[PDB]
Chain A
């Protein structure tokens, strides 16, 4: 779940508060819709798509699903005791976090006008 996604971000990207990613580009945080403003927005776009596919698994809710993971000594791991849904979600978030750690950060792309550039 997001609390866990939060904690994931905090362990792969220490130097940056997770908030920095809760309202960025067209896909990070807010809804979505439109061409990703950049790579960091692309990471999120791919993260939004991942959730939508997961939503296909019945009774699977990307935001509230509590999965099993762990982050130690710079390693983010999705555990084996997860059902199909939790596993999927975990991996979505996991891929995203790792994606975040490798993408640049443009401050101009933080909290841009969604309505005029993407709703």
Chain B
């Protein structure tokens, strides 16, 4: 569910 950049 979550980010790198």
Contacts and interface: CB of A to CB of B under 8 A. Distances in A.
B5 to A, nearest CB: 5
Contacts of B5: 5, 22, 27-29, 44, 47-48, 51, 96
Interface residues of A, number: 16
A67 interface: no
Chain B interface extent, by class: under 10
Interface string A20-38: 0110000111000000000
Contacts of A110: none
Contacts of B3: 2, 22, 29, 63
A111 B4 CA distance: 12
Nearest to B2: A22
